[PDB]
Amino acid sequence: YYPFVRKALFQLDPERAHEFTFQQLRRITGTPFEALVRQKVPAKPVNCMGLTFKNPLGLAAGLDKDGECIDALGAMGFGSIEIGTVTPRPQPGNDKPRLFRLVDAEGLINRMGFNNLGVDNLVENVKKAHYDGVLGINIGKNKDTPVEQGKDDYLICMEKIYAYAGYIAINISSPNTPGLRTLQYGEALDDLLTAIKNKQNDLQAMHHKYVPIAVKIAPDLSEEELIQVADSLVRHNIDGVIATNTTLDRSLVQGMKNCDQTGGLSGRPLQLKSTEIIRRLSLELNGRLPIIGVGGIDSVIAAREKIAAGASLVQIYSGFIFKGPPLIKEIVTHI
């Protein structure tokens, strides 16, 4: 019964709670105790980006940044698992504390800084996984890499993960790496999308398989910024768009503890804004490429609203923390 577990884990700070939870998941992955987290969810396959997903609910990136719990998290019913974000070289990320709960808002604020162990380590973790669903691999730029040379970091990771990823996610939407969000704008985006698609085409020739690429945008794009982003994604033949990442907005959490903490806001305070972006994004795209909707999905209806907005799949992070594995079964069963 999750609410009791939640009350217990919430006595820890959010990052220590995750570290404690991942300790348990590692200690049961492969064990006859691994069934302790297995969940029977109805099958609901969906074809998206040429891939066939178990069901339309995936685990958003940022929970398993290094991909060390794919099997246990996959047993919970997720139709897909997105690991990352990972960078070429490992890096520590921002200083702690860098993660904060807004319990009354059922939201989180984070300035992690791409804390990860590097792409090579992720590949080794992936090689040991048995997940039968779709594996997304989310890559980003190292902090020290210059913004205008950020493409290189994605291309490096793409080469190491192509043979192992079900699909690849391009993170240019974090608020916590300096200048990463400028890669969403004008020439920077076109320059980047070009480099990525040419690398994709060269890796298809080398590995004799097409791995789709989806770009993860931010929810703080203006209407004109979003139209340009959509257009650029169609012109470069990107296979998907993940909308959205966390928000700089605080207008809905004013007066609550940790509302002035720098970083990106997620959970319920992001739901509405995320949904509106997907709807505007869907209208621009006009079905030319699919949308993976994410942001504050904490219920069957909330997930259906994202589908109505124009999304083909959905992801969850904060609602899995605040409402637990039951929310997985809810969404898969009734979406």
Ligand X SMILES: O=C(O)c1cc(=O)[nH]c(=O)[nH]1
Ligand Y SMILES: Oc1ccc(Nc2cc(Cl)c(O)c(Cl)c2)cc1
Known binding positions for FMN? 61-65, 85, 138, 171, 216, 244, 267, 296, 317-318
Instruction: Name the segment binding ligand X (CB under 6 A); options: 2-10, 104-112, 183-191, 197-205.
Output: 104-112
Residue 171 binds to ligand X (criterion: CB under 6 A): yes
266 is catalytic: no
**What angle (nearest 5°) sits at the alpha carbon of residue 264, between those of residues 24 and 175?**
110
Please give the annotated binding residues, written as ranges. 61-65, 85, 110-114, 138, 171, 176, 216, 244-246, 267, 296, 317-318
How far is it, in rounded angstroms, from Cα 190 to Cα 233? 9
Instruction: Name the segment binding ligand FMN (CB under 6 A); options: 3-11, 155-163, 182-190, 294-302.
Output: 294-302
How far is it, in rounded angstroms, from Cα 229 to Cα 282? 12
How far is it, in rounded angstroms, from Cα 196 to Cα 157? 11
Q: Are 139 and 200 in contact (CB under 8 A)?
A: no
Kind and range of the H or E run holding 199:
helix 186-207
Residue 112 binds to ligand X (criterion: CB under 6 A): yes
**Choosing from 173, 174, 232, 266, which is the catalytic residue?**
174
Find the shortest distance in angstroms from Cβ 257 to ligand Y. Answer: 14
Which residues share a beta bridge with 138? 84, 169
**What angle (nearest 5°) sits at the alpha carbon of residue 298, between those of residues 265 and 239?**
75
Which one of residues 289, 321, 332, 335 is an interface residue with ligand Y (CB under 6 A)? 321
Q: Are 192 and 150 in contact (CB under 8 A)?
A: yes
Find the shortest distance in angstroms from Cβ 134 to ligand Y. Answer: 18
User: Residue 132 carries which side chain, given as an amino acid letter?
Assistant: D
Find the shortest distance in angstroms from Cβ 270 to a copy of itself. Answer: 9
- Which residues of the chain form contacts with a copy of itself (CB under 8 A)? 3, 104-107, 251-253, 255-256, 268-269, 271-272, 275, 299-302, 304-305, 308, 330, 333-334
